[PDB]
Amino acid sequence: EVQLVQSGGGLVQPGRSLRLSCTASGFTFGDYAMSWVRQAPGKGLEWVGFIRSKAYGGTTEYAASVKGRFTISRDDSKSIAYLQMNSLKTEDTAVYYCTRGGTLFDYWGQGTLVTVSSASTKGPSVFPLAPSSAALGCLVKDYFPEPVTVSWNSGALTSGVHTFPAVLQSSGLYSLSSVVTVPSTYICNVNHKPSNTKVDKKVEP
Amino acid sequence: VVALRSRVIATMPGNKGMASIAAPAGEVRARIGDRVEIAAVNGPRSVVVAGDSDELDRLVASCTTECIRAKRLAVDYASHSSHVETIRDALHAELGEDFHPLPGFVPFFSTVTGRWTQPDELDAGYWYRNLRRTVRFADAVRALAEQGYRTFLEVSAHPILTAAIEEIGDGSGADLSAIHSLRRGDGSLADFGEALSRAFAAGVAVDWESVHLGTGARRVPLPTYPFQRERVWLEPKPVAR
Amino acid sequence: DVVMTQSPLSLPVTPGEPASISCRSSQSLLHSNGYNYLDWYLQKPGQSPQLLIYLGSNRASGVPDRFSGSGSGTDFTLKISRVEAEDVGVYYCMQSLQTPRLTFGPGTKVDIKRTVAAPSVFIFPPSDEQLKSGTASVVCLLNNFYPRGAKVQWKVQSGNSQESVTEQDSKDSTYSLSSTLTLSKADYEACEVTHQGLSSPVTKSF
């Protein structure tokens, strides 16, 4: 089949050099013009660039946002497309895709999560949400990076559990606020995997 | 949990030890005395004992005058007793600091309770319950049989408990299977394959599509099922005129 | 200039019912060859974008027959003959006349359709240990609401609120909002919504 499998995501500080590789197996790599479409977390897709086919010249067209910063290449005998991401800034935290068409995006690959944050690996600051008088929840403010997983009654309660998608502060940290809704005295265990800091939270009004 | 538990517990030796006998619970629970108690009934004819020294050594000797499997546990230590309960920090909570209780999933089986419990109590409290209370393992094996469980695979390097799982069924009407674990002296894949065989034999569902993936084998024509044929013919009924 | 393409950005779909996303382009996408240069892409929630339709009406192979394509030079349409549970996501109307295209468009936010719900506004004052910690986070969790078009204010004003929303769940098919007012030491010394699950402003404070 055509499979554009990608590789090369990770965590860097603004101003680094990161490589994005697009392994194309299933089609003649030299006929298509691979392109790289960026999708910042939770917004619409923005097209980064694309290299023309070697037979179409190989001229690489980039965006206005990343001209002079990113450069895109391709190789047939090794059959890989490259997004060379230089001088990254905070905007490059995103899921970069590799489609097989300049004007006709096709396979799209899988989704390489690249993150450019200035933060360091710290566990959660688990802050509970006391009920007004109702629902019971708990914050996970100031953790980095995502993964994160929050259960209630340690994975016993699954009905009513809403693990709000995480949120980025200006400081580069993450904040999940997981909340259950049930009338009552409940526990929330957050496990920040990169640092392995499992904190537990007992909540009352 | 196990590393820190064993680490600290390495100091109590010299005061108390452990033993494992397959005597019926009646006589030993009658003759126990001088800081001696049953750590774990593992069957109607099997009881692990946790008692002090110089009486627990003569408890397997109160089992050599009766001539039973005599094993003075060389891993002897303090558990299910008070000599380990005093440590309400290292042997009670330091072993297990992080824990993620699981939900229903596939029913597990806790013993200190004697019944199936959700795996939500599995933490340093449970290791506190393996050092404070008994194990009542036999009660949980009866509950396994009640919830439809009969083939028992001994995760070890020698059968000591499946041996005792067969005294579960030496007096129980639900005679249960207890696949013989790698023998004392067995430590190779030839003996593991011999176990996988008797596991299939006893009734253990083996995913044979996992044993044969690294082998790179092929399937070759084998004889089909030998149907043992009766003589079933219903003849048109009647006799002419 | 550039082709500006818009769509019914918040189109609801109910399973088993034909639906219709539309696209409207400022310029004419019918190039001289008689072939429209509009493409229809699908990004299923948290997956790689898919190519549903190329050249306005032609359907890409491997794409369910349900997605049908049509349109003139300005107005266009995608007619899903049968919306099931995989037909939900973001439908991007993406031109081809003027490459380059810095954006794929806002995209049609498709949702499994039910009736209107009742936003469960739950003002949760920050735990005081947090004030002991150096920050303040009063959280106005709205829960179980659909559609997701709720303003959420912070008065007594707003401007320090940051947004957290999950995609549509399965058995209730609603949305949930975590509007966090991260905050500082002193200025701790009210939230409401204008979701069409109600009409009047419902203001409850810490």
Shared-domain flag, residues A99 and A152: no
Shared-domain flag, residues A12 and A78: yes
DSSP per position, A99-130: ES-SSS-----S-EEEEE-----B-----EE-
Element (H, E) at A70: strand A70-75
Last residue of a domain, one of A72, A94, A116: A116
- Sequence-ordered alpha helix ranges (H) in chain B: 2-9, 25-31, 124-132, 137-146, 162-165, 189-202, 208-211
CB–CB contact C96 A103 (8 Å):
yes
Shared-domain flag, residues A68 and A45: yes
Shared-domain flag, residues C151 and C162: yes
For chains B and A, tell me whether 3 or more CB atom pairs sit within 8 A of each other: yes
In whole angstroms, what separates CA B85 from the centre of its chain? 25
CB–CB contact B100 A156 (8 Å):
no
Shared-domain flag, residues C200 and C130: yes
Question: Could you tell me if residue B219 is inside a domain?
Answer: no
What's the CA gap between B38 and C74, in Å, rounded? 86
Report the candidate in B75, B77, B76, B71 with the shortest Cα–Cα distance to residue B184.
B71
- Relative to beta strand C12-13, strand C111-112 is parallel
| One-letter amino acid of B48 | V
> Token pair for residue A7?
């590789």
Q: Tell me the residue length of chain B.
A: 241
Shared-domain flag, residues A112 and A151: no
CB–CB contact B120 A154 (8 Å):
yes
Q: Which residues of C135-173 are buried (b: 16+ CB within 10 A; e: fewer)?
A: bbbbbbbbbbbbbbebebbbeeeeeebeebbeebeeeeb
Contact A45, A38 (CB under 8 A): yes
What are the chain B neighbours of A189 within 8 Å (beta carbons)?
100
List the beta bridge partners of residue A74: A81
Shared-domain flag, residues A89 and A154: no
Smallest Cα distance from A170 to chain B, Å:
31
Shared-domain flag, residues A91 and A21: yes
Tell me the residue range of the domain where B157 lies: 1-202
B100 at A interface, C-beta within 8 A: yes
CB–CB contact A189 B118 (8 Å):
no
Shared-domain flag, residues A112 and A132: no
Last residue of a domain, one of C113, C144, C175: C113
Question: Could you tell me if residue B213 is inside a domain?
Answer: no
Tell me the residue range of the domain where A163 lies: 127-203
> Phi and psi for B91 in degrees, rounded to 5?
-90, 10
| One-letter amino acid of C196 | Q
What's the CA gap between A124 and B174, in Å, rounded? 52
Residues 83-142 of A with CB under 8 A from C: 97, 99, 102-111, 125, 127-132, 134-135, 137, 139, 141
Report the candidate in C42, C10, C11, C6 with the shortest Cα–Cα distance to residue C27.
C6
Q: Nominal resolution in Å?
A: 3.2
Residues 138-177 of A with CB under 8 A from C: 139, 141, 162-167, 169, 175-177
Contact B17, B76 (CB under 8 A): yes
Contact A16, A84 (CB under 8 A): no
Determination technique for this entry: cryo-EM
Chain A residue with minimum CA distance to C61: A106
Shared-domain flag, residues A76 and A98: yes
CB–CB contact C125 A102 (8 Å):
no
Shared-domain flag, residues A11 and A96: yes
CB–CB contact A191 B100 (8 Å):
yes
Shared-domain flag, residues C62 and C128: no
Question: Could you tell me if residue B87 is inside a domain?
Answer: yes
State how many domains chain C has. Answer: 2
State how many domains chain B has. Answer: 1
Contact A4, A27 (CB under 8 A): no
Half-sphere exposure at residue A85, Cβ-oriented, CA atoms within 13 angstroms: 29
Q: Which residues of B100-112 are buried (b: 16+ CB within 10 A; e: fewer)?
A: ebeeeeeeebbbb
| Reduced 3-state DSSP string for C13-56 | ECCCCCEEEEEEECCCCECCCCCECEEEEEECCCCCEEEEEECC
B117 at A interface, C-beta within 8 A: no
CATH of the domain at C31: 2.60.40.10
Shared-domain flag, residues A105 and A136: no
State how many domains chain A has. Answer: 2
| One-letter amino acid of A113 | L
Report the candidate in A126, A121, A124, A122 with the shortest Cα–Cα distance to residue A137.
A126
Shared-domain flag, residues C76 and C120: no
What are the chain A neighbours of B99 within 8 Å (beta carbons)?
154, 198
Tell me the residue range of the domain where C32 lies: 1-113
A15 at B interface, C-beta within 8 A: no
Question: Could you tell me if residue B229 is inside a domain?
Answer: no
Last residue of a domain, one of C51, C82, C113: C113
CATH of the domain at A90: 2.60.40.10
For chains A and C, tell me whether 3 or more CB atom pairs sit within 8 A of each other: yes
Question: Could you tell me if residue A161 is inside a domain?
Answer: yes
Question: Could you tell me if residue A193 is inside a domain?
Answer: yes
Q: What is the Cα gyration radius of chain C?
A: 21
End-to-end CA distance of chain A: 57
CATH of the domain at B40: 3.40.366.10
- How far is CA C143 from each of CA A154, A168, A204, C137, C179, rounded to the nearest angstrom? 22, 21, 20, 18, 11
Last residue of a domain, one of C85, C113, C141: C113
Question: Could you tell me if residue A122 is inside a domain?
Answer: no
Question: Could you tell me if residue A85 is inside a domain?
Answer: yes
List the beta bridge partners of residue A178: A138, A163
Report the candidate in A89, A51, A54 with the shortest Cα–Cα distance to residue A69.
A89
Shared-domain flag, residues A12 and A111: yes
Shared-domain flag, residues A90 and A47: yes
Element (H, E) at C141: strand C136-145
Last residue of a domain, one of A116, A143, A162: A116
Shared-domain flag, residues C109 and C142: no
